[PDB]
Design a protein. Structure first.
Length: 378
């Protein structure tokens, strides 16, 4: 029959499981101990806590849902974090590798502070690669679902440490014309404009899609040859946006192909890019939203486009621009996980309020473009 001189009431001390890799040791802490001081105590008891410069490590509270794990701040007391006996804390390197696909398509690993937001990590990336204007870039996933809120963490958006992200330049309209004199740059502009049309991010009419595909045939096959380029030849999924992949499109495409004549590969690329740049939809960020129409119960899908100068409504079928508002004439906006609303003050009667799961994306684009206009005046 013996007493334990180590015993402290469960009410007056915190008993925490400290994990380092595969090692776990249970340690007792005064609850007011600051995180910084708890790290020192950990270094005094667990040898694997000495695996580097001491200020390289901190405390991370894990959770069965990884989105809910959090880094603890060095100046906070343990009991700030509402810890209970038997909770687990990881003694963890503050910096971790983050794999980023560079603008040349290769993947580079960059150490980032794992407690920070996506904006902070972007800035660290841009600093490493000599990019001063980080506001021209963003990080996206490479899985709609690839958008990242740069004011939040990767962790809370479901991005774990294994995942490679993409550094992506934002869209800017070109100050130079489309020439034939720089074939390598021409091909880059063509591939960009073509992929945007084929993957639906640049929405176009059915007629225009078949015109683009006509130039595409000229580029890929040379001049039209009625011996070879007959019904059934084209894999239409490679020449038309998904919603236009229909057999009746091939005849339209072959007409556009024939109309190119003996046009060279370079000349067709110039024409393809010029046709894309000629459309009111070119360069616009589009979102499929659901509108409430006066005198109709079922909502109507509509394309909502955001540019550096305006918001536009675009017909989902014909891609006709139905209506355009200048960013200058928007009084305020609001977003929720289910809807997005614009208030135009006395420029019109009633708000524009639509159902969408991308409302925060839309709001951040508008705010970003407005801050740019606002920053040129001051």
């Amino acid at each position: 029959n013996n007493d334990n001189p180590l015993f402290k009431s469960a009410m007056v001390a915190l008993s925490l499981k400290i994990s380092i890799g595969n090692v776990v040791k249970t340690m007792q802490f005064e609850p007011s101990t600051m995180v910084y001081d708890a790290c020192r105590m950990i270094r005094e008891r667990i040898p694997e806590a000495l695996a580097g410069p001491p200020n390289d490590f901190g405390l991370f509270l894990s959770d069965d849902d990884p989105k809910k794990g959090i880094w603890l701040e060095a100046g906070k007391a343990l009991d700030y974090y509402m810890l209970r006996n038997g909770d687990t804390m990881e003694y963890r390197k503050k910096q971790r590798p983050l794999k980023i696909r560079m603008l040349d398509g290769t993947v580079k690993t960059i150490m980032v502070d794992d407690s920070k937001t996506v904006t902070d990590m972007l800035m660290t990336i841009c600093a490493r690669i000599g990019i001063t204007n980080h506001d021209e870039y963003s990080l996206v996933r490479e899985l709609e679902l690839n958008w990242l809120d740069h004011g939040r963490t990767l962790r809370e958006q479901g991005v774990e440490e294994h995942e490679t992200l993409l550094l992506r330049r934002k869209f800017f309209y070109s100050d130079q014309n489309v020439d034939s004199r720089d074939p390598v740059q021409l091909n880059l502009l063509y591939v960009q404009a073509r992929d945007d049309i084929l993957n639906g991010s640049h929405p176009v009419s059915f007629d225009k899609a078949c015109e683009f595909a006509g130039f595409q045939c000229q580029i890929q096959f040379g001049p039209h040859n009625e011996q070879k380029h007959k019904a059934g030849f084209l894999d239409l999924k490679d020449f038309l946006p998904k919603e236009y992949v229909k057999q009746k499109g091939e005849r339209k495409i072959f007409q556009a192909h024939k109309n190119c004549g003996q046009m060279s590969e370079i000349e067709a690329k110039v024409r393809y890019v010029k046709l894309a740049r000629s459309l009111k939809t070119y360069g616009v960020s589009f979102f499929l939203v659901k509108e409430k129409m006066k005198g109709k119960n079922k909502l109507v899908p509509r394309l909502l486009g955001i540019t550096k100068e305006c918001v536009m409504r675009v017909d989902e079928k014909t891609k006709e621009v139905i209506q355009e508002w200048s960013l200058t004439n928007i009084k305020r906006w609001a977003a929720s996980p289910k809807s997005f609303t614009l208030d135009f003050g006395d420029y019109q009667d009633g708000y524009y309020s639509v159902q969408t799961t991308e409302g925060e994306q839309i709001a951040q684009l508008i705010a970003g473009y407005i801050d740019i206009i606002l920053k040129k005046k001051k």
